[PDB]
Amino acid sequence: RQINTEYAVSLLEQLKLFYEQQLFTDIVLIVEGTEFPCHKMVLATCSSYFRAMFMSGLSESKQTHVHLRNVDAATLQIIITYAYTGNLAMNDSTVEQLYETACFLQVEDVLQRCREYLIKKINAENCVRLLSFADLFSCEELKQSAKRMVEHKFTAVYHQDAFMQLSHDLLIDILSSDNLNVEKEETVREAAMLWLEYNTESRSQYLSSVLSQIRIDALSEVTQRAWFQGLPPNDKSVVVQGLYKDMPKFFKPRLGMTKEEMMIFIEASSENPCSLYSSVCYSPQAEKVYKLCSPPADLHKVGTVVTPDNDIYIAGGQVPLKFRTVNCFYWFDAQQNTWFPKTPMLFVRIKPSLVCCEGYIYAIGGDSVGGELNRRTVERYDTEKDEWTMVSPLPCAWQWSAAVVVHDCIYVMTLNLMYCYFPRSDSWVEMAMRQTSRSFASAAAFGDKIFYIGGLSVTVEIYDVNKNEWKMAANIPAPCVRAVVISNSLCVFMRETAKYVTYQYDLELDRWSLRQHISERVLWDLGRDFRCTVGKLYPSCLEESPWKPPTYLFSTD
Amino acid sequence: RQINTEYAVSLLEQLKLFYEQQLFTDIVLIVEGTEFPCHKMVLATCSSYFRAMFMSGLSESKQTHVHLRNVDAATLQIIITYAYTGNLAMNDSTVEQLYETACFLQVEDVLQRCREYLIKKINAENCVRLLSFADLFSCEELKQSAKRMVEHKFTAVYHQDAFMQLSHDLLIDILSSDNLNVEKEETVREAAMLWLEYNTESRSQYLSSVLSQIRIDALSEVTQRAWFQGLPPNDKSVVVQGLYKDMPKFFKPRLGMTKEEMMIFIEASSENPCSLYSSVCYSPQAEKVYKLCSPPADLHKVGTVVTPDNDIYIAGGQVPLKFRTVNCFYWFDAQQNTWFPKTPMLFVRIKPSLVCCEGYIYAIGGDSVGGELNRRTVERYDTEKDEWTMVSPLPCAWQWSAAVVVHDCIYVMTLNLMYCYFPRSDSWVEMAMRQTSRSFASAAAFGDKIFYIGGLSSVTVEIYDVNKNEWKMAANIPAKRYSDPCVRAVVISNSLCVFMRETHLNERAKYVTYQYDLELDRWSLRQHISERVLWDLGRDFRCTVGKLYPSCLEESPWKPPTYL
């Protein structure tokens, strides 16, 4: 019928065998003294540059020796190896030079592969360098991705040396963007100052363009501090999602002045049957719920973890049988409301205990008991390296266990025992046991004390990290509880099968005070298996969908 | 790392794009005046001949114009097309010329594909021509396959013009081979006589080699008729598997002489835990059960057919879904005991009523597919053309119907009706209706009478006349009361018979065959099937009549005798 694949792979392997023994070599490429015999047809079919050079009919198609300059020998070898096979060795050490050589040779396949690899490899350490690279080589997709990454973590990357060596257009397009994740304009002002003072003799003429991009007369959230905070309870968030929108974009409050602390509920049951495992985030300050497009592959049984840098991650879980367990790792883009996948895990897990410790995210347990040494395995992920490293596994196989982090130390709790992990020692130490044997309990690290609340019957058990002793505090004022720390205060979001209400606990007085009721106006039944956490998100452009009539039960009579 | 092919499939089509627009043309091949610009690199990777002529470093690698002689321009274009795409578009008209061009250029890929294509193409017309073609080009695989086909139908292909033009070496191995399917030694003698008189001036010196290969003092089966037939009942068959088992191979009876009519049972139960649908045959003369291999590889619910030319085929069926219906079609080899495959059907089928009429095989019924479109699916197959064609469907959709052939007419029967198909008109004509409504019955043909026996079964026997178009009752199968006989009508020794497997209350299966009296309208006890062999075969077994090689098939009864 058409091109047969069975002969195609045989012809390709025969061409490779002929190239290895140097048969029918008609062209000789000279790169910085090194010689490479090759065929003109393969280079023409793979690279359009060689195609145009050979189809011109000039001496280049007649002379056997062609001198190629400004081309690395290793990159040319990788291009030619790929030209005779199809496997691309893309590593983080030589990806930029490979992309440069490909764009100089115009290999569409290699160009696209290197582009997508660089896009899936943008971290918080190379974002600025990759942005400069994309600007120099005019790659719009990589440029936009790196710009978004810089806008997401500007306050963390504006100290790097790559930021002070940026061009003028990059500076004026980064500073003018309203997506700068900064809590104060003073940070952007000091960034511009250090950029202009890095090289004064060449940037003394750009001081006007520098000062014209920093908002000085904005006065975003200081004007509210001048008059008063007099409003309905914590209605400063309404001004955030109101004044910001309607703004000439010159005095606009930057995106960093818009993030609000919201209770992130994932796998929260939804009235809509299609998405019975949806995810919504109720803002305690704005008193409003915001819809999330959280499920990237309509799956569930995934854990939640919020780093101190306010980053959301989900891992583990299983997709419906097209319920096969998977390894995908998803990071949430708080600006685009879309999860970008990462390097999959090494072992499949179901609701893994994900906690952030010393910049690493650890996957603890969260899987059905299979194999003595095969289970209880613990694995951590490197953020910048995008890799998974195995660590000392769990001492014993547990179920429905929780994990917290205090003082850069890992803690996992079980029925009545407790083990503390130290990354510096990579070992497990059994700690003070608990007087009660309970399951399905929720735990949240607050200050120097770990709170263990649950049991499936509620009892507030306080552990001291400094004393290694467990002391009883009280009971949850009531049961489906979710202990979460918000507003620098320990709280418990309890669901009374459904009624919703949040309580505040006093550590000194050992008393639980009513903090705020969550009227059934919105926040419908979220089920019982939903995972909860605390994080700051931009309500400005997250999602807007009430979905719930705040009034019902007509009283006309 | 792992070599990807998304780049190979793109590099290949990019090379074709340059070949069509004639870029990088470094060599021009001249064949009978026609020019064919191509690349020296591509021809070397496909053909080892060009690889040798280009890597020699001589003027052939430096001169752009190369004159290739004795090469067809049409076949060369196909070879070049294959080198740039990989799809070989072969046909029965230019396969022998393409193989000659391929072997002259020594293309391992084209030669292998053209070799297997010719093997699956050997019919009852090209066998002799392909045999001389294989010897001329020294293809040991095609030569052996073509030779076995000549030995199978030697009595039907020795009249072709290709047989008298065979070489001397091609004759000495055919006549000396003991696989000649001939009923009498005179056929081989006359076949050798017509060969030497075809060209006397060039074969007058080979008259001694011709007579030295034909067995004259053999006297295979003319000796048994001389003395007498005095033996246990029809034990002339035990002598067949005895004289041909020990002889100097010069006076051996040829394979054709070694033949026995056996009741072929396909999809029968197995004594040992094995294929639930096994295939075994019973020789009523040798009183021996032979085992048949099943290359179908666990086919289920298949049909059977035996042509008047003693050819066996199976079609349709279902295979266990790794059950799914397929359109497979296999031909049985009477000598190699295999089941070669043949051009599949157009539609998948289950137990089709396969019948042979005027040399054509027809697949009737067979697992109606697409009830909305049509249910009465039927199609014919040309053995020589190896092609399937749709024909006039049945007038109505029925189930568990039978099909027979009488006087070159295709008769299909149903619950109470019967339709006659005429291939000369390609239409269906309703015939006389049956008086009793019966299903799952057996059908048979003998002389001018069609027998629709069995069915609900019962012992009722219906005799239909083609010349009178009338259905009438004649007699009832004499069986024991309260028994459950699953009968199968079979015609053997030019006489209608019924292979009746009787299973009684608390008793094992009993097999027995009776003979019907046409003039007296009676059923006579013909032969009791020994229970020391022929173990239980179930009820869904298919049966037919055919001749096989007792000399060579697979003699393995095993069934342990003298029990209790």
Check A24 against B10: CB less than 8 A apart. no
Radius of gyration of chain A (CA): 29
Distance separating alpha carbons of residues A223 and A243, to the nearest angstrom: 12
Three-state secondary structure of A225-284: HHHCCCCCCCCHHHHHHHHCCCCCCCCCCCHHHCCEEEEEEEEECCCCCCCCCEEEEEEC
Alpha helices in B21-94 (DSSP H): 40-46, 48-54, 59-62, 73-84
How far is it, in rounded angstroms, from Cα A61 to Cα B289?
76
Structure tokens, B162: 């290709």
Residue A159 DSSP label = T
Contact: A55, B23; criterion CB under 8 Å: yes
Any CB–CB contact under 8 A between B13 and chain A? yes
Neighbour count for residue A543 (Cβ, 10 Å)? 14
B15 interface with A at CB cutoff 8 Å:
yes
Q: Which of B11, B86, B87 sits opposite A42 (nearest CB)?
A: B11
Q: Is B10 on the interface with A (CB under 8 A)?
A: yes
Yes or no, beta carbons of A41 and B46 under 8 Å apart: no
Q: Which residues of A touch B45 (CB under 8 A)?
A: 11, 14-15, 18
Q: How far is A26 from chain B (nearest CA, A)?
A: 9
Between CA A36 and CA A57 the distance in angstroms is 22
Chain B: closest CA distance from residue A14 (Å): 7
Q: Which helix (H) or strand (E) holds B363?
A: strand B360-364
Which among B7, B14, B46 has the least Cβ separation from residue A86? B7
Q: Two tokens at A39?
A: 């065929």
Write the residue in A2, A3, A40 that is nearest to B24 by C-beta.
Answer: A40
- Residue of B2, B3, B78 to mutate when probing chain A, most A C-beta within 10 A: B3
Between the two ends of chain B, the Cα-to-Cα distance in Å is: 69
Would you call B293 exposed, middle or buried from its count of C-beta atoms within 10 A (0-12, 13-18, 19+)? middle
| A491 three-state secondary structure | strand
Chain A: closest CA distance from residue B91 (Å): 13
Partner-chain residue, chosen from A6, A24, A41, that has the shortest CB–CB distance to B86: A6
Measured in whole angstroms, the distance separating CA A114 from the mean position of its chain's CA atoms is 21
Q: For residue B48, what is the DSSP state?
A: H
The verdict on a CB contact (< 8 Å) between A11 and B54 is: no
| Residue A2 in contact with partner chain B when CB distance is under 8 A | yes
Alpha carbon B180 to its chain centroid, in Å, reads: 17
| Cβ <8 Å between A14 and B55 | no
Which chain B residues have a beta carbon less than 8 Å from that of A109? 6-7, 10
Exposed / middle / buried, residue B422 (Cβ in 10 Å: 0-12, 13-18, 19+): middle
Cβ of A42 under 8 Å from any chain B Cβ? yes
Spatial distance between the Cα atoms of B262 and A256, rounded to a whole number of angstroms:
92
Name which of B14, B41, B87 is nearest A24 (Cβ-Cβ).
Answer: B41
Instruction: Note whether A21 contacts B: Cβ–Cβ < 8 A.
Output: no
Spatial distance between the Cα atoms of A516 and A522, rounded to a whole number of angstroms? 14
Residues of chain B with C-beta less than 8 angstroms from the C-beta of A48:
none
Kindly give, in sequence order, each residue whose CB lies less than 8 Å from that of residue A151, ignoring residues fewer than 6 positions away: A174, A177, A179, A180, A181, A255, A335
Q: What does A313-365 look like in DSSP terms, one character per residue? A: EEEEEEE----EE---EEEEETTTTEEEEEPPPSS--SS-EEEEETTEEEEE-
User: Chain B contacts of A82, Cβ < 8 Å?
Assistant: 7
Strands A27-31 and A65-67: parallel
Nearest-Cα distance to chain A for B370, in Å, is 28
Rounded Cα–Cα distance for residues B11 and B431 (Å): 65
Residues contacting B164, CB < 8 A, separation 6+:
B194, B195, B198, B199
CB < 8 Å to A39, chain B = 41
Under a CB-based contact definition with an 8 Å cutoff, are residues B239 and B226 in contact?
no
Tell whether A15 lies on the interface with B, counting CB pairs under 8 A. yes
DSSP letter for each residue of B281-311: EEETTTTEEEEE--TTSS-BS---EE-TT--
Task: Kindly list the residues from chain A whose CB atom is less than 8 angstroms away from the CB atom of residue B19.
Answer: none
- Taking CB atoms and an 8 Å cut-off, how many pairs form between chains A and B? 99
Reported in sequence order, the residue ranges of A358-455 that DSSP labels E, i.e. its strands, are 360-364, 378-382, 387-391, 402-406, 409-413, 418-422, 427-430, 439-446, 449-455
A 75-94 → B contacts, CB under 8 A: 82-83, 85-89
Compute chain B's Rg from CA coordinates: 29
Comparing C-alpha atoms, which of B434, B550, B447 is closest to residue B491? B447
Nearest CA in chain B to A17: B45
CA distance, residue B40 to nearest chain A CA (Å): 8
CA A34 to chain centre: 43
When CB atoms are compared, the residue of B5, B46, B87 closest to A2 is B87
Beta carbons within 8 Å of A297's beta carbon, 6+ residues apart: A319, A328
- Separation in Å, CA of A487 to nearest CA in chain B: 51
Write out the two tokens for B13. 């089509």
Helix (H, G, I), strand (E, B) or coil at A300: strand
B2, B83, B85: residue with CB nearest A87: B2
A435 in contact with B at a CB cutoff of 8 Å? no
Beta carbons of B85 and A3 less than 8 Å apart: yes
How far does B38 lie from chain A, in Å, by closest CA?
12
Is-contact B59 B66, C-beta < 8 A?
Answer: no
Q: State the nearest Cα–Cα gap between A60 and chain B, in angstroms.
A: 12
Alpha-carbon span B466 to B449, nearest angstrom: 7
- Tokens linked to A319: 């997709």
Hunting for tokens 């309208």 — which residue is that?
B521
Give strand ranges (E) for A50-90. Answer: 65-67
Task: State whether B40 and A55 contact (CB < 8 Å).
Answer: no
Q: Please provide the DSSP assignment of B99-139 as one string.
A: HHHHHHHT-HHHHHHHHHHHHTT--SSSHHHHHHHHHHHT-
The alpha carbon of residue B323 is apart from the nearest alpha carbon of chain A, in Å, by 22
Q: Is the CB of residue B314 less than 8 Å from the CB of residue B543?
A: no
Distance from C-alpha of B400 to C-alpha of A238, rounded to nearest angstrom: 78
Tell me whether B533 touches chain A (CB under 8 Å): no
CA distance A430 to A435: 15
Q: How far apart are CA B549 and CA B564, in angstroms?
A: 34
Residues of B in contact with A38 (CB under 8 A): none
Phi, psi of B205 (to 5 degrees): -80, -15
With CA atoms as reference, the chain A residue closest to B85 would be A3
Asked if residue B255 lies in contact with residue B151, where contact means CB atoms within 8 angstroms, the answer is yes
Across the interface, whether the CB atoms of B24 and A41 are under 8 A apart is answered yes
> Which of B255, B85, B270 lies closest to B174, judged by CA?
B255
CA angle B432, B433, B436 (to 5 degrees): 140
Q: Do A86 and B6 touch (CB under 8 A)?
A: yes
Instruction: Report the Cα–Cα distance between both ends of chain A, in Å, rounded.
Output: 76
Please say whether the beta carbons of B279 and B234 come within 8 A: no
The Cα–Cα gap between A331 and A349 comes to 17
Contact state of A87 with B1 under an 8 Å Cβ cutoff: yes
Pairing of the two strands B409-413 and B418-422: antiparallel
| Token output for B206 | 């080979």
Which chain A residues are Cβ-neighbours of B1 within 8 angstroms?
87, 89
Q: In chain A, count of helices (H) and strands (E)?
A: 16, 28
Round to whole Å and give the CA distance between B288 and B298: 25
Token pair listed for A178: 């309203």
What the block records as the tokens of B327 is 């359109």
